[PDB]
Design a protein around this ligand. Structure first.
Ligand SMILES: CCCCCCCC/C=C/CCCCCCCC(=O)OC[C@H](COP(=O)(O)OCCN)OC(=O)CCCCCCC/C=C/CCCCCCCC
Ligand SMILES: CCCCCCCC/C=C/CCCCCCCC(=O)OC[C@H](COP(=O)(O)OCCN)OC(=O)CCCCCCC/C=C/CCCCCCCC
Ligand SMILES: CCCCCCCC/C=C/CCCCCCCC(=O)OC[C@H](COP(=O)(O)OCCN)OC(=O)CCCCCCC/C=C/CCCCCCCC
Ligand SMILES: CC(C)CCC[C@@H](C)[C@H]1CC[C@H]2[C@@H]3CC=C4C[C@@H](OC(=O)CCC(=O)O)CC[C@]4(C)[C@H]3CC[C@]12C
Ligand SMILES: C/C(=C\Cc1c(C)c(O)c2ccccc2c1O)CCC[C@H](C)CCC[C@H](C)CCCC(C)C
Ligand SMILES: *[C@@H]1O[C@H](CO)[C@@H](O[C@@H]2O[C@H](CO)[C@@H](O)[C@H](O)[C@H]2NC(C)=O)[C@H](O)[C@H]1NC(C)=O
Ligand SMILES: *[C@@H]1O[C@H](CO)[C@@H](O[C@@H]2O[C@H](CO)[C@@H](O)[C@H](O)[C@H]2NC(C)=O)[C@H](O)[C@H]1NC(C)=O
Ligand SMILES: CC(C)CCC[C@@H](C)[C@H]1CC[C@H]2[C@@H]3CC=C4C[C@@H](O)CC[C@]4(C)[C@H]3CC[C@]12C
Ligand SMILES: *[C@@H]1O[C@H](CO)[C@@H](O)[C@H](O)[C@H]1NC(C)=O
Lengths: 675, 28
């Protein structure tokens, strides 16, 4: 029975449906599940005001503001602001009751339904950790997590210290393992394994110890990328097995503790840290409280033999023969199997939802592809054609949007175009044709268009299950250029910038070089292009290698005339910045020399000196002051959440008092308690 | 503003906004 001790079960337990049900409903200690429930509820209580947007609800759902929203289904609409505050209140109460274990089933539902409603209301708020919170709440809804360390058991003794079925731990462990393993498999991407995804990250001071034995490139490639990929691929296996659990726990704890400081990912790292002990024995909190000194052993509740529970069946040789598997047991086993199968399948289901497939696969948030794809957006142009007069106009990129994710997804772009066509009549624009010229570089590739700029997105066809025709393909046979691009970028001066552009055949780039962008040049790297100067109506054909100087404050056009995609460079200098810096340096040096033996230009120098002095002082300032400031900001966020929620709840229950009273209440809500 | 002119709409060689970290979709 070596396999039995290594796995927790035997091969005979999987040879029949009845034995699988019996194994998956075997009684288990609920202490570990209870501690995880308490910690998850606490972290959700902390996260509702911060990341879920309770503190900025009045800004996001203002009751008269023109805004383009991006729900998963267009039939889903946000409620008025007071009702949105009620939804967030119900979600917060559900999180409170989940953390406490009080009215656990109702509290689970009361957190789950508004949480998923808020999730589906806005596709642009989707990420992997919010999706994980939804999944964890869904799982915990069906579990007996209030059998320990809960006030439900403190007000009802039968629920106290009652055993839970084994599938409660199996589903959660499978979820955590799936997160780790699918993240690792998604990191088996050419961009990640070649160190392109997160190449700036190694220069964080938290990676200093590795630099005592590695170079910058080596710690970027081996530690951040290969190290992260190995950790993701091996964390579930290390945590599952008893022999490797201490090492796995240490590595996973280090991973999450570094991630909490490297990134702003809400409470994800703490949720994963709290999920790690789910792989330990279900009795570990009991051992932890039994290892304490005897002086603190008379106030905690006595640790006795847990009582039998009805939620799980008992199979004994002496204690009767056995009992038939009840409907609840089969339902739990089937839920375990089906849910884990769905969790395995969904990250690789993008071949069905082709309409959500851009350069990357699917909507972001449920594939566990964290930090794999980095996007740099160079420029967005939104042009409309008036359907009545034929006049061409241009919109500010993102007028009525609260997010930038529409730049990368054809579904969000279609929603944005529909919203603009609905809203622009209010701005004296008849039925508009709207075109999008969006330039993106993904993982330091050539900047290129993601959508067809000649296609009217208002009338363009989009379907969930069909690949979008107006999405430009990613120029994959140009990635090996990245080493050369990086060499060019690092081989430049400190005042010059470079933009690398790849353009499709038959298309052209209309460019207005700013007046202050003197010394602007274009150099061809691949294919052939024709550069047209609009003012002089002159076309000069470029070949591979030649560089052309371009005028500032004037228009020019780059036509890709080659049958294959062309790549060219833009090297430019902020010449006004050069003049400003040289005159500022000369003025400062002359003044210093005269003294030792106001105007905006000197105002900039004074501001820079003051900022440098403040930065130096803050570095010299003890971290207790920084901690106090951080706590004050968080307390402001929580106080504002509470006060605006109270205002809206009173509006719902009693009514709106008056404009003056509401204004005074809102002013008091933003008071910045102790600044 | 709501509308841009032909001039400011076509200056691709502008400094990007760089609002926080607009590179990774995982960040808040
Ligand atoms: C081989 C079947 C899968 C079982 C896991 C094999 C382990 C090898 C690598 C997996 C690493 C971690 C995976 C995630 C853990 C989830 C499963 C789990 O908790 O199993 C342990 C647990 C025993 O618990 P303790 O005695 O505490 O064991 C502690 C270890 N000393 O055993 C079980 O729960 C038995 C579960 C039977 C399998 C059901 C769960 C897995 C479902 C697979 C997902 C796909 C659905 C069905 C697939 C159809 C085709 C097979
Ligand atoms: C009626 C009650 C009234 C209460 C009034 C109190 C008055 C005192 C005022 C203080 C207010 C502070 C409250 C807020 C709490 C802390 C703030 C907080 O969490 O902030 C988030 C902060 C970082 O946020 P950033 O994203 O950097 O913020 C910048 C925004 N981009 O995150 C955290 O620090 C998370 C804190 C949670 C830690 C708790 C433990 C987490 C889990 C780890 C457990 C380890 C494993 C244990 C094993 C068991 C597992 C089964
Ligand atoms: C249903 C909630 C699931 C929560 C999702 C969380 C992550 C799960 C992974 C799936 C993510 C996205 C896949 C969604 C597929 C279904 C989408 C859908 O039906 O509606 C899309 C589309 C909305 O388009 P927008 O881009 O908002 O409009 C642009 C114009 N302004 O809606 C419509 O066109 C109307 C109805 C479309 C056809 C109805 C669907 C019939 C087929 C049924 C299968 C689809 C659902 C299967 C569920 C899978 C389990 C998650
Ligand atoms: C003398 C006058 C000016 C009274 C003003 C007092 C306010 C500053 C108080 C009133 C309501 C208080 C809030 C009431 C409830 C909470 C919930 C509480 O929620 C928790 O997260 C604690 C439990 C947990 O850690 O999970 C955090 C403090 C906070 C925001 C309190 C912060 C301070 C507030 C805003
Ligand atoms: C950017 C990285 C991972 C993305 C990510 C994040 C942020 C998560 O939150 C995840 C949570 C669960 C599952 C997957 C996640 C995920 O994919 C690697 C970041 C580099 C990392 C910090 C370097 C450390 C690598 C090894 C472990 C360090 C060596 C160990 C020493 C103690 C010897
Ligand atoms: C425009 O900028 C380019 C580069 O930003 C300048 O070219 C440099 O000229 C110096 C000579 O003073 C050389 O040492 C460098 O190697 C050149 N760099 C490159 C990339 O070619 C050019 O001189 C600038 N033009 C003006 C008029 O100032
Ligand atoms: C510069 O070259 C282009 C060819 O790339 C000339 O023709 C234009 O080509 C674009 C791209 O196919 C078409 O959309 C235009 O309709 C073409 N005609 C015009 C008038 O733009 C272009 O004419 C040349 N410019 C000059 C001043 O001769
Ligand atoms: C009042 C309504 C809108 C609140 C939202 C409730 C419904 C829509 C919510 C409740 C629980 C949610 C499910 C919870 C878990 C999963 C598994 C995941 O892999 C895909 C989505 C899916 C299947 C969710 C779909 C949406 C869902 C069914
Ligand atoms: C530098 O050039 C950019 C154009 O790319 C411009 O936006 C910026 O204002 C210039 N610098 C200064 C100090 O004006």
């Amino acid at each position: 029975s070596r396999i039995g001790k290594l796995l927790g079960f035997e091969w005979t337990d999987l040879s029949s449906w009845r034995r699988l049900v019996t194994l998956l409903n075997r009684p288990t200690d609920p202490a570990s599940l209870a501690v995880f429930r308490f910690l998850f509820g606490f972290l959700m209580v902390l996260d509702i005001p911060q990341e879920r947007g309770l503190s900025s609800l009045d800004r996001k759902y203002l009751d008269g503001l023109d805004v383009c929203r991006f729900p998963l289904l267009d039939a889903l609409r946000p409620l008025p602001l007071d009702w949105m505050y009620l939804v967030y209140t119900i979600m917060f109460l559900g999180a409170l009751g989940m953390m406490l274990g009080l009215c656990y089933r109702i509290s689970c539902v009361l957190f789950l339904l508004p949480y998923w409603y808020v999730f589906l209301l806005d596709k642009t708020s989707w990420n992997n950790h919010s999706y994980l919170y939804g999944l964890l709440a869904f799982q915990l809804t069906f579990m007996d997590a209030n059998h320990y360390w809960s006030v439900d058991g403190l007000l009802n003794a039968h629920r106290r210290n009652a055993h839970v079925p084994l599938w409660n731990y199996a589903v959660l462990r499978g979820q955590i393992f799936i997160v780790y393993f699918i993240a690792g498999v998604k990191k088996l991407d050419a961009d990640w394994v070649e160190g392109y995804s997160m190449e700036y990250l190694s220069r964080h001071w938290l990676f200093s110890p590795f630099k005592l034995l590695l170079s910058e490139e080596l710690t970027s490639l081996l530690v951040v990328h290969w190290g992260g990929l190995l950790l993701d691929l091996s964390a579930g296996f290390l945590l599952f097995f008893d022999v490797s659990r201490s090492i796995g726990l240490f590595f996973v704890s280090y991973f999450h503790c570094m991630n909490s400081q490297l990134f702003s990912i809400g409470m994800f790292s703490y949720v994963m840290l709290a999920s790690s002990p789910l792989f330990c024995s279900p009795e570990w909190p009991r051992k932890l409280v039994s290892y304490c000194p005897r002086r603190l052993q008379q106030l905690l509740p006595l640790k006795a033999a847990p009582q039998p529970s009805v939620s799980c069946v008992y199979k004994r040789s002496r204690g009767k023969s056995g009992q038939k598997p009840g409907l609840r047991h089969q339902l739990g086993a089937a839920f375990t199997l089906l849910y884990l199968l769905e969790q395995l399948f969904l990250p690789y289901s993008h071949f069905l939802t082709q309409g959500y497939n851009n350069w990357t696969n699917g909507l972001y948030g449920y594939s566990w592809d964290m930090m794999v794809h980095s996007r740099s957006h160079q420029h967005v142009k939104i042009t409309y054609r008036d359907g009545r007069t034929g006049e061409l106009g241009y919109l500010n990129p993102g007028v009525f949007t609260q997010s930038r994710r529409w730049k990368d997804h054809a579904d969000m772009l279609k929603q944005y175009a529909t919203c603009l066509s609905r809203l622009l009549p209010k701005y004296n624009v008849t039925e508009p044709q709207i075109y999008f010229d969006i330039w993106v570089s993904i993982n330091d590739r050539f900047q290129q268009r993601i959508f067809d700029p000649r296609v009217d997105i208002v009338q363009a066809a989009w379907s969930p299950f069909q690949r979008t025709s107006w999405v430009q393909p990613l120029l994959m046979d140009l990635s090996p250029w990245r080493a050369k691009l990086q060499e060019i970028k690092s081989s430049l001066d400190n005042h010059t910038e470079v933009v690398f552009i790849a353009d499709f055949p038959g298309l052209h780039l209309e460019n207005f070089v700013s007046e202050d962008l003197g010394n602007t040049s274009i150099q061809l790297l691949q294919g052939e292009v024709t550069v047209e100067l609009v003012a002089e109506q002159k076309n000069q054909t470029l070949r591979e290698g030649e560089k052309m100087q371009l005028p500032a404050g004037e228009y020019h056009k780059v036509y890709t005339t080659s049958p294959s995609p062309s790549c060219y460079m833009y090297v430019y200098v902020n010449t006004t910045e050069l003049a400003l810096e040289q005159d500022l340096a000369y003025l400062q040096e002359l003044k210093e020399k005269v003294e030792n033996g106001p105007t905006p230009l000197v105002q900039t120098f004074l501001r820079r000196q003051q900022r440098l002095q403040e930065i130096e002082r803050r570095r010299n300032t003890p971290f207790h002051e920084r901690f106090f400031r951080f706590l004050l900001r968080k307390l402001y966020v929580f106080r504002r959440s509470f006060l605006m929620t109270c205002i809206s709840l009173r509006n719902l229950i009693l009514g709106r008092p008056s404009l003056e009273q509401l204004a005074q209440e809102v002013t008091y809500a933003n008071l910045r308690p102790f600044e | 503003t709501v509308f841009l002119d032909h001039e400011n709409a076509n200056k691709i060689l502008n400094r990007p906004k760089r609002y926080n970290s607009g590179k990774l979709e995982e960040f808040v």
